[PDB]
Design a protein around this ligand. Structure first.
Ligand SMILES: O=c1cc[nH]c(=O)[nH]1
Ligand SMILES: [Ca+2]
Ligand SMILES: [Ca+2]
Lengths: 433, 433
């Protein structure tokens, strides 16, 4: 068997067999298939794609390259969650503590941000003393003890994916359905959870720009989980504009706290209660989705949700007192606004542009090795559909430097006003079970 | 600039500027741009393509990587020739010494194997001691003192093509009009010859499957040569089946010697006379094509062509005695035969698959650093039109290993049979001047 012949099969739009795919992955991981042949195959896939069966085989071959986490030591159904990537995506910070406050065992690994998309790991680090580099044994202890653990994606699992993603990053082959599906699922399956709830983002701030692309991505990932016995489910949500109002790290943590206390943005709250209901239901902690939601709503109203957040924080080294005293969180020295040109209605608020603007401010990194300024970011004041008056603030920039024209300009490039009322996009497009 | 930003430009269907193209070729050649990024770019070019302008800029960039030769010293019209690649193309081995025997100065650069297609540089290395990498100064001194020279690149001439050619060969990025055109033309330009006769293959065994595709590639190349003051013409020959019988390296050289003596295959002899007469006419060594043709047929019968072949070999270190005794040429330890499943007529033939099978036997490389076997290959016994009976041998395999059921099945699958008679396909289709 020759790698070149297989690249050719893909180039000509033919389907690779499971045996060919397995041969490829192990050869790439062990070094017998050089990067120059893998990069060519990756570009061929970017243009030709894969069948649902091909993508499944690619995923299993990557799972095989590493070790599998045994979480049996934790009794009951363990639930995992994962977003495809977005802007202002505060979800996990709220969802995790919320579902664990009603008894759901949350076993979750996350990643850091890069480019115009944020990372939960980076947001968690804005909390004084929080540790994300947790081992397999520390992880199990945390879940058994508090019912939740959100840690960094510890080396060791799926080495083939770590290698391949790095390659896709320098060859412009990141945004490919087959490569995105197999990347995310290989990690969740290797992580060990019994149930997996996926949040597939669609729009300008996502990898899947078109709705039809998002549907195909959610579908193949759900199918992949069910093939190996995991209880998988997915929602397709809006990312044409940032979720909530805050975009950053310390600012997104403050938004998470206000939401858990019952005073957050309507879209963030609705998304969490919807994703949460599925997590609770799948963990068999409530008879139906309606009962599961009532529990979550009661948990917020009672104060159990915010209590579980503090416990979550302290358990990993976090300074829990930042919850009732937000001022202990990193603060930016400067604040300035972006005002509306004229009266009208917001029609566009491009997530990718807002994402890049935040990154330039210091809330994101251009390359993996870069350090983040945890205090800076952008807080939006209006969303698509909202009426605006000429001279009214549309966004506030939080910075540690007074010269921010490059940021203000990117934010202005994101907005488009209309003289007539605009139709608001749906927060949730569809649910795949 | 950043290579990844350029791969992404081409990936999205945009055209690269002259400056970007030169920057890429420059960086790749000095080693600052890694093979995996270049192979990713080459695959994006395969799907998205390039404009007439982009293709010309690429061609010149690769010429500018080395130095262009000045053949003024040599008196008269110096001629060059090149094929777009095929299966069993022994052409150059016969045609080179043939025309050179009648007074036409030959200054040619060739390449090694490329995908399912053979390479004259590899075929010539089958001859004991034959050097294919002589200095530019020795190249000029050889075309003068002998009136012929066939060498390989990477000798200060087109360093970029040397690299990109080897990479394309093992990454399945060989069949792109802009990569083929720029590869061939950059060599013809850097070589320094006045006239250029191109042999554009069309059919299954070629990169250009349909006539329209082949006509398009001939046009692009002929226009590129004229644009720089070269007498450039092209001929579109058939490759819907291998040329002659032999397919390999040492096996094709033996076919060359047999043809140069007037004992060779009709289709191969014919093609060499067609292309050869064009070379003599453009060199002004004959009043017309027919006179040039009859001048070639005379060099064969007189034995001046074969005597010219021996002188050619010895001039570049080769062993001339190999013509006398084909036993001095590399031989394969094993012999196997492929036979007919039923009686009938050879209708079609997947020539590319027959070329790949030969490469599987070791006639071609699987990775860049690979070492090939010059003794292996395939020898057909039946062609399109011929009548066959069950059990009759269609071909004979030459292997360095006993087990070849993989190769034996690929060849058998490539040769289709039929109940009714079938016409022999035409050797020449068109002529572009
Ligand atoms: O692309 C091609 C094909 C044949 N010969 C070359 O030099 N390049
Ligand atoms: Ca937010
Ligand atoms: Ca031949």
């Amino acid at each position: 068997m020759r790698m070149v012949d297989l690249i050719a099969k893909k180039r000509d739009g033919k389907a690779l067999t499971k045996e060919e795919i397995e041969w490829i992955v192990r050869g790439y991981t062990n070094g017998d298939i050089p990067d120059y042949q893998m990069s060519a195959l990756a570009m061929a896939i970017y243009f030709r794609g894969m069948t649902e069966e091909e993508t499944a085989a690619l995923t299993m071959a990557m799972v095989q390259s590493g070790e599998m986490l045994d979480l049996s030591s934790i009794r009951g159904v363990k639930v995992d969650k994962h977003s495809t990537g977005g802007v202002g995506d505060t979800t996990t910070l709220v969802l995790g503590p919320l579902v664990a406050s009603v008894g759901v065992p949350v076993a979750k690994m996350s990643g850091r941000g890069l480019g115009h998309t944020g990372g939960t790991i980076d947001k968690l680090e804005s909390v004084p003393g929080f540790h994300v580099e947790i081992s397999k044994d520390e992880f199990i202890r945390l879940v058994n003890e508090n019912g939740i653990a959100i840690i960094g994606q510890t080396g060791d699992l799926t080495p083939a994916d770590k290698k391949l993603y790095a390659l896709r990053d320098v060859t412009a082959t990141v945004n490919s359905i087959p490569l995105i599906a197999s990347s995310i699922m290989s990690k969740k399956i290797a992580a060990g959870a019994d149930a997996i709830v996926l949040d597939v983002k669609t729009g300008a701030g996502a990898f899947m720009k078109k709705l039809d692309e998002a549907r195909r991505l959610a579908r193949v990932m759900v199918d992949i989980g069910k093939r190996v016995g995991r209880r998988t489910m997915a929602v397709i949500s809006d990312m044409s504009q940032p979720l909530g109002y805050a975009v950053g790290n310390a600012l997104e943590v403050k938004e998470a706290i206000e939401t858990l206390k019952g005073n957050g943005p309507h879209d963030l709250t609705e998304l969490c209660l919807t994703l949460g209901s599925h997590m609770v239901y799948l963990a068999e902690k409530a008879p139906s989705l309606d009962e599961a939601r009532r529990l979550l709503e009661e948990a917020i109203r009672s104060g159990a949700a915010i209590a579980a957040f503090k416990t979550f924080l302290a358990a990993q080294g976090g300074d829990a007192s930042v919850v009732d005293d937000l001022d202990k969180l990193p603060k930016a020295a400067y604040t300035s606004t972006v005002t509306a040109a004229a009266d009208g209605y917001v029609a566009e608020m491009a997530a990718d542009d807002i994402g890049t603007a935040a990154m330039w401010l210091g809330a994101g990194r251009a390359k993996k090795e870069d350090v983040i300024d945890l205090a800076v970011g952008i807080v939006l004041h209006k969303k698509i559909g909202d009426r605006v008056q000429k001279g009214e603030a549309l966004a506030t920039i939080h910075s540690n430097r007074p010269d921010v024209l490059d940021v203000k300009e990117k934010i202005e490039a994101a907005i488009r006003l209309s003289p007539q009322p605009v139709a608001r996009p749906p927060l949730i497009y569809e649910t795949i079970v």
